[PDB]
Design a protein around this ligand. Sequence first.
Ligand code: MGD
Ligand code: MGD
Ligand code: SF4
Ligand code: SF4
Ligand code: SF4
Ligand code: SF4
Ligand code: SF4
Ligand code: MO
Lengths: 814, 234
Amino acid sequence: GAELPAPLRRTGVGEWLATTCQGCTSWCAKQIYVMDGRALKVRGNPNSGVHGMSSCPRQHLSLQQVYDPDRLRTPMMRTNPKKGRDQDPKFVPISWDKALDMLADKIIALRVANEPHKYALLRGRYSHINDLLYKKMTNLIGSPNNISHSSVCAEAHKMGPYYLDGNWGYNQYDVKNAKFILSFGADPIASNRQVSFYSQTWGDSLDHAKVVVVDPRLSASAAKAHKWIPIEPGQDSVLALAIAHVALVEGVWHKPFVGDFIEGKNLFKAGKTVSVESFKETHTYGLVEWWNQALKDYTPEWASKITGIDPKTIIAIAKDMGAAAPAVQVWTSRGAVMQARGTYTSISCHALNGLFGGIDSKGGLFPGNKTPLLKEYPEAKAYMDEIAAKGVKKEKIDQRGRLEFPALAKGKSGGGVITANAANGIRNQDPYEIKVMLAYFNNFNFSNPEGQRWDEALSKVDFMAHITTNVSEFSWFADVLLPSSHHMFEKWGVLDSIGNGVAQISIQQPSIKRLWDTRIDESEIPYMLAKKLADKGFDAPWRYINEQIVDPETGKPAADEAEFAKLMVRYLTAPLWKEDASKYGDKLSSWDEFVQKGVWNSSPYKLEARWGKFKTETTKFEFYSKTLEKALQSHADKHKVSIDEVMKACDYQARGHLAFIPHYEEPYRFGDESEFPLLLVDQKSRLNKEGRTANSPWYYEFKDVDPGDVANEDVAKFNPIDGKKFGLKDGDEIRITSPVGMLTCKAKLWEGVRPGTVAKCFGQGHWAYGRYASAKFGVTPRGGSNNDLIADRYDRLSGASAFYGHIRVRVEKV
Amino acid sequence: MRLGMVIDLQKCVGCGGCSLACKTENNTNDGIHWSHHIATTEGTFPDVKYTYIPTLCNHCDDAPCVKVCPTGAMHKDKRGLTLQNNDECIGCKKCMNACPYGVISFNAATPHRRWQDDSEVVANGTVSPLMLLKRTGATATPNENPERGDTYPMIRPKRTTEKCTFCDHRLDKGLNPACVDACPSEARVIGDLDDPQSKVSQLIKLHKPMQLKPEAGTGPRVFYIRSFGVKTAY
Ligand SMILES: Nc1nc2c(c(=O)[nH]1)N[C@H]1C(S)=C(S)[C@@H](COP(=O)(O)OP(=O)(O)OC[C@H]3O[C@@H](n4cnc5c(=O)[nH]c(N)nc54)[C@H](O)[C@@H]3O)O[C@H]1N2
Ligand SMILES: Nc1nc2c(c(=O)[nH]1)N[C@H]1C(S)=C(S)[C@@H](COP(=O)(O)OP(=O)(O)OC[C@H]3O[C@@H](n4cnc5c(=O)[nH]c(N)nc54)[C@H](O)[C@@H]3O)O[C@H]1N2
Ligand code: SF4
Ligand code: SF4
Ligand code: SF4
Ligand code: SF4
Ligand code: SF4
Ligand SMILES: [Mo]
């Protein structure tokens, strides 16, 4: 135990290798420290322009994922032909060649029978090399059913940005220059999409920004904010609309962006209409129409009656935002908008970003910077045979585009995925049966609301293969398991991130020798499957790969699996390192320099870039969304109904012009409030790497970094008022029941919970995944599975699943 | 020389990244965390305050753990750190009762015993803790950091105590403590409190410093500045 002499000391002499973390869609650039062939540490990549060395705490849990003792080391096949929660699959090990043979035989049988559309590809997480496995392979087989997870993620959060300013996507928030931050449910030092960077900056920003957090629970961000507004779930838009109302009455919209009355005098008087011709809008459209049709009556008193918020607080917030403009940013979280009528909460909250001029402004918010990363491999039309051309025209299994499922992504009827509804199409064989399914990086039985519907659906699929590191809940229903090399340590990939005024592109690369007999989901596996299909007489995918996915420097196809894995990344990133990317950001001299740095950074965002040229119908920032009217009109015309009939069929309250402006939709609620007196407030753990750290012991050891939670436990948090009402004490074993299901967990009394609600982290309740994540693997869960409580409901205008606002529950001691 | 740390509570977001970094750096057994925290919730709804205070060894000026140690295993070094010759620890636990802060842990459990399990959740399909140990070449856990062994056992023996060493092995190489490097907001700063020009010396002049349990008379050298929360507006 003597200290080692200097020549034999080991501190600091190991190797740092660049990769990318995917614990959340922050997608931080990382370096991995390697010594004795083992990954020992993770840090933020110092070359990153978004976040630098800053990181959230979950980077360290990555090390218990790659070295998870319940990872699969071999392909497997089930030997119990029955599937179900009660059916042990009795998996036995097989070779890759045998596993892909079974899958290939089933795919080819579909084509021979002229039913290629009965194939489905399911995608959970992914990297930007996904186009081959997700889209090209699927369409070449002849199926339209490439089903992402986007609608169980955040599609409703894109409705406001798209239908108001043309951005079907996320924003970055300029916190370093903000003077007012208003968060509707966002908790950016714990979740959302740059936890590393917003954690870096949040505390410092409190010295120049006033911060208000609107959330039914006291989140970490609210605990470090100037005001916590404990909103009743589903009432966010009431506050957003009343703030806008006060802004107009007080005359404190941002005139350089919005415009002004022609004669100077502010004519917005509460309750009274204004002449449209009296106002000259600059970069916006529809302000007076919005006022005349609804906003003139969304007074602070109206809002206080619904929410209990002091009207003086509403007025003070509106005035503070007016004085801070344009250095004003409004965040929306999933909690505010992933509700059955949530499209109009996204619109109502995001409208404030236009009203106070924050959109594309200093201290405001704006989209990701332009980069030259390619996102698709070459077109495959020339490789489509007649079977495939017919199949890809079939209705999608998720029923997108039907009257009651407009899913208006990017303005198109049926434009968006409806992930959770694919289970309903499958189990009802409507539009048709799914007979062959390939799925990767996903666990929809656990992550989708009312996931037992996925139990039911998958039990009815003739053949399914799951590409996964662990035997998760979804894997339980697979015929074949195809073990994936771990995305962060054993894979070639590429991702991007936005924040700090920049967009970055980062590499994923293997940092260790491959541990087990696994293959990379998005490159090696489709390559091997294409070879197997070609051996069996269907060579279109193989020809597509070998003729179109060739090296950007040599023009040669990959010689083998390992080369192909790297080639997939080289191909899409060639504009960064083979060509001169100086016009967009960094100049990289070679592929090797890109790999060594591990990240490419854009130049800083040009403020006001989009002013006067939004990708909306008017090219303006639309308070009256002609963009959404055009999309709804298209959907209505498709189904030979009026727009009002669309609204009625999709269970929105809006009629007439209200369908196109920010307005109040009463939140949808399910269940009798007398039997189910509490509203569920679902939240993420700040130690969740999505649904993937429940088999990491360090997760449990530090679980109380979630404010109010308890180490090594799964707790539901009740206000002490409700604890007294229901006879609950800390540590009591409890059952929580909704109209659709139940879970068991433990009780915690916490004053940071709005009375009448119960705040509980999603992430526990696994009955599979591994030995730490479950009580008895395959049988008994650890903790309680939130989504068993959440009825299968949709924001039908976006396709999004609802996880918030509508869930009523009751509680009792077990 | 009196090395110490200043922690800025306004910058701190209460994420535990420092404590997880310590786990990866120092190979502490499951349940043993040299870096930890004290969190408090105060007030009745809706006027609720939550605060998180990161904690570690305070490397005290007048360390009672050193004074009571019967073997001399616990000792001060020339940097002012409280370090331990683990080889001379007899597991008497006197240090733990003397320390006012509860930052010392006792290895009653065999460290990393959960990695000796060779059961598989799916037989001949998934792996096992023991198999992962064999595959990676590690001795006790695939997550063990060999650097730790420069100055302290990489894996401590049962029936010894252990605590934060201020990442002495990293300081010896001119590097930063793992928890300092791990902090996203740079809330943690270390330096020589005897140097008036050090960043730590200047921080506690620019801001009013606070210490945990100064009344215990140990002269702790972790100082807290500013506030985790802010006063409510409106
Ligand atoms: N730690 C962690 N961070 C992550 C992820 C993760 O898994 N773990 N996933 C990433 C991904 S994929 C996503 S899509 C983003 C999502 O990031 P966000 O969209 O910002 O939201 P969530 O993290 O899902 O948190 C939902 C929050 O809404 C609150 N809330 C619940 N109901 C209501 C309501 O009715 N009104 C209001 N105002 N609030 C309500 C909950 O308390 C919770 O704080 O996070 C990314 N960041
Ligand atoms: N109640 C509630 N439900 C939610 C959320 C919430 O906040 N509350 N968050 C929702 C959100 S925002 C999202 S985006 C969705 C995400 O939901 P999903 O896309 O279903 O993602 P996960 O649940 O993380 O499942 C990923 C699965 O991939 C496997 N896998 C794990 N690691 C790897 C790897 O490295 N490679 C490969 N090929 N496979 C791997 C495992 O089977 C793992 O279970 O969950 C959502 N569901
Ligand atoms: S978990 Fe998310 S925020 Fe944290 S380091 Fe990984 S990608 Fe970044
Ligand atoms: S890493 Fe930094 S911000 Fe996170 S808890 Fe530790 S000191 Fe605070
Ligand atoms: S904090 Fe405790 S263990 Fe550390 S030096 Fe002070 S008395 Fe000793
Ligand atoms: S347990 Fe070890 S370090 Fe502590 S007082 Fe006893 S001999 Fe000294
Ligand atoms: S200084 Fe080193 S040993 Fe001490 S808490 Fe920080 S990481 Fe752990
Ligand atoms: Mo998501």
